[PDB]
Design a protein around this ligand. Structure first.
Ligand SMILES: N[C@@H](CC(=O)O)C(=O)O
Ligand SMILES: N[C@@H](CC(=O)O)C(=O)O
Ligand SMILES: N[C@@H](CC(=O)O)C(=O)O
Ligand SMILES: N[C@@H](CC(=O)O)C(=O)O
Ligand SMILES: [Cl-]
Ligand SMILES: [Cl-]
Ligand SMILES: [Cl-]
Ligand SMILES: [Cl-]
Ligand SMILES: [Cl-]
Ligand SMILES: [Cl-]
Lengths: 163, 169, 163, 169
């Protein structure tokens, strides 16, 4: 089935800028991974935001919900920061307009542009999850699927975990 | 305290995915399993046992090699299996495994890479992530996971000139 | 001739840490480059500091000067941040105890662990400079050799330039 | 306003440094010059003109190939030259160039890589930086810059089994 990928920012997309003396959320790394993936099927990417997910407001989550509803596609990947991925995912789970879609959130604990990143694995795993899971909203990280309503980010473990 | 389960086992048979440069050869050999390098930085919740079966270019596989892969997969207790392999005779191995009654309750996915993981611009890491998800989520059967898609081995062939798996119409 | 490499930190050595939500100055990247360089000769690496060079004090520059004087070797590479590389280099140029040494400072505008970094090139170029230049103190960046006394960092160009 | 000079010219002749995977070949070919990829992110003050002479494994070089490299280097106006090349017959090309009176005023450095730049764990970027410095800083003559050292071609041989240039005692 056609997959629509929305990019909202996060650590996955961070890149170094000399002006900042550090990282900024940069161009979406999922486009760099899919460029070499030799894809057979119909996939397209849309930018929604370039924010660290710590910076997301309730107005941002509402805007993300409406944007995902602008896609006719029933299989959606949203790349996002991990720090408020649960808050977005739980918000999207409450939108009756998205009930027929499979919506998977993912991202990376280490930027794709930094050595030793989880990003490319996570993108492959999450694209499969978006194609194969039944309608609902899910987090695909750490090589497994999480139910947002029963998940939290454990900042001491650096992992999502059950509540 | 919650214990993270480990329901996937991976077997490695070689292929372009695992190729690495050797100075003594003036070229590539089939080297150490690249899937182990991808999983090292995947930040997995579980742990994945990785078992080496062979280190061959799949052009070099014989019927006896295919039979030996089938015996190893049938011995596994896990019902979710990823086999990394060369793409050139991946369909032959997948169709062979499909005919084995000892695999009937297992989800067995074959994958690899058209470009070595250790070469720049490789599909390998994406393919591993996709294929791990497919091994978890697909019903029992035998599948090829490549190009961000699932292929039925009976209805698929390798197009070597264009470096892709394609349907038989 | 034997080369002694001192690592003082800088952007070259930055690496991502989940706890920080960003980069820290991490393990010296020159050790990662030399591990695959297939070296023939005698080279050794010593850690001096893990600081962003913005954070260096006059006490730090004095301590760097004494540390370089602890090396018997007459060919020295000091990896360092670019923001106060001129201040360190000018300070070391004034130390009569270092007059017989060839001391080359280098680093990278982009961290070695980030994609698209100048670091490995810069390390190769700077190791040659440390071996081949006459006694003195030099900055080796941008594929050329700078005299510290006649150089400044241009933060608008992202380059060292003559004064 | 100050103008950054460009005193180095680079010539590319191929070698392991430039190898890249090709699916059609099921293996490596000598591809696009890797030195161009290193210089793209080097943040150079100048600009370096890069000129392709050949795309060969140096095992394949003939006397006529060596003569054609000499003519191209002698034509250059620059007196600082880096030639990227295969390591297997780098000494033969370097000793040949050494005997050419048209190069007597030039600093000519040959370099390459034991591992392709496009393979993980390559010496190539380091070697390019080192060799660019050597081409700038060394007196007129012909040199091999490898292993973080400068070699005199008349006193050097390639040890293929151990993947290194070494002195003749
Ligand atoms: N602070 C980042 C962390 C991450 O993405 O891992 C974010 O949530 O955007
Ligand atoms: N000849 C290789 C091709 C590949 O894996 O893409 C193999 O089948 O092992
Ligand atoms: N702020 C960094 C900048 C750099 O190294 O390029 C430092 O001077 O440590
Ligand atoms: N056979 C290769 C070896 C190398 O470059 O290291 C060549 O000489 O082109
Ligand atoms: Cl080897
Ligand atoms: Cl090969
Ligand atoms: Cl795939
Ligand atoms: Cl940062
Ligand atoms: Cl190709
Ligand atoms: Cl070298």
């Amino acid at each position: 089935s056609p997959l629509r990928i929305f990019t909202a920012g996060g650590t996955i997309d961070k890149d170094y800028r000399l002006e900042e003396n550090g990282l900024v959320v940069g161009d979406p790394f999922v486009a760099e991974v899919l460029k070499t993936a030799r894809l057979a099927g119909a996939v397209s990417i849309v930018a929604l935001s370039r924010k660290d997910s710590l910076d997301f407001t309730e107005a941002d989550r509402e805007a993300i919900g409406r944007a995902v509803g602008q896609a006719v596609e029933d299989h959606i990947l949203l790349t996002h920061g991990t720090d408020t991925m649960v808050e977005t995912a739980r918000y999207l789970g409450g939108l009756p307009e998205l009930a027929g879609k499979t919506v998977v959130l993912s991202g990376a604990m280490v930027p794709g542009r930094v050595g030793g990143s989880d990003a490319a694995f996570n993108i492959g795993f999450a694209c499969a999850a978006a194609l194969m899971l039944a309608p609902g909203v899910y987090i695909a990280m750490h090589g497994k699927v999480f139910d947002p309503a029963k998940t939290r980010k454990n900042r001491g473990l650096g992992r999502f975990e059950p509540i």
